[PDB]
Amino acid sequence: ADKELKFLVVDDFSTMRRIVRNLLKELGFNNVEEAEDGVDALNKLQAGGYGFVISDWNMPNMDGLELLKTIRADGAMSALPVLMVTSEAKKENIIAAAQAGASGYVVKPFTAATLEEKLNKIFEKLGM
C-alpha cells in the first residue's frame, strides 16, 4: 500500500493508540493521527485527507460501532476502510460490526503479526 496513506487511530486509551501508531511506523506508515472517541474522530475525518481508520469500540461520546455506522452512511467517506480493534470478542459484537460494514475486526490483545496480517487483508480486498 501507499506509504503516505493517512491513518486515523481511535481509542479512548492512549496505550492502544500508542501501540497501533508504533506498529504502523514499523510497517512504514508515518502519516498517522489519533482521536479519543468517535466524535473527536469524525471531527478529524471531516478535516479531510484520511485513507484508513482503525478504531476501538468502547469509548465515551460515541462508541466505535456508531462511528463505523456514521462513516458508512456519509456519502463522502462511505467506503473509507474501517478496521475495528477492540476487547469485544463476543460473536454478536463481531456480527454487529461486520453487518455494519467493518473492513476487518481484530480482538485485543493482539500481536504485531495479527495487526499486520489483518491490515494487509484489507489492502488486498480493496486493491490498495
Annotated binding site for Mg(2+): 11-12, 56, 58
Cβ atoms of 84 and 93 within 8 Å: the answer is no
Q: DSSP state, 4? A: T
Give min distance, CB of 93 to ligand BEF, in A: 9
CA distance 120 to 1: 8
DSSP of 7-74 = EEEE-SSHHHHHHHHHHHHHHT---EEEESSHHHHHHHHHTS---EEEE-S--SSS-HHHHHHHHHHS
Nearer to ligand BEF, 3 or 99 (CB): 99
Residues that bind ligand BEF (CB under 6 A): 56-58, 72, 86-88, 100-101, 108
Nearer to ligand BEF, 24 or 82 (CB): 82
- Which residue of the chain is nearest Mn ion when measured via CB? 14
Give min distance, CB of 48 to ligand BEF, in A: 21
Nearer to Mn ion, 40 or 56 (CB): 56
Identify what 88 binds: ligand BEF, Mn ion, none; CB under 5 to 8 Å per kind: ligand BEF
Give min distance, CB of 8 to Mn ion, in A: 15
CA distance 85 to 11: 9
Give min distance, CB of 80 to ligand BEF, in A: 12
> Which residues, including other chains, have CB under 8 Å from residue 16's CB and lie 6 or more apart?
56, 85, 108
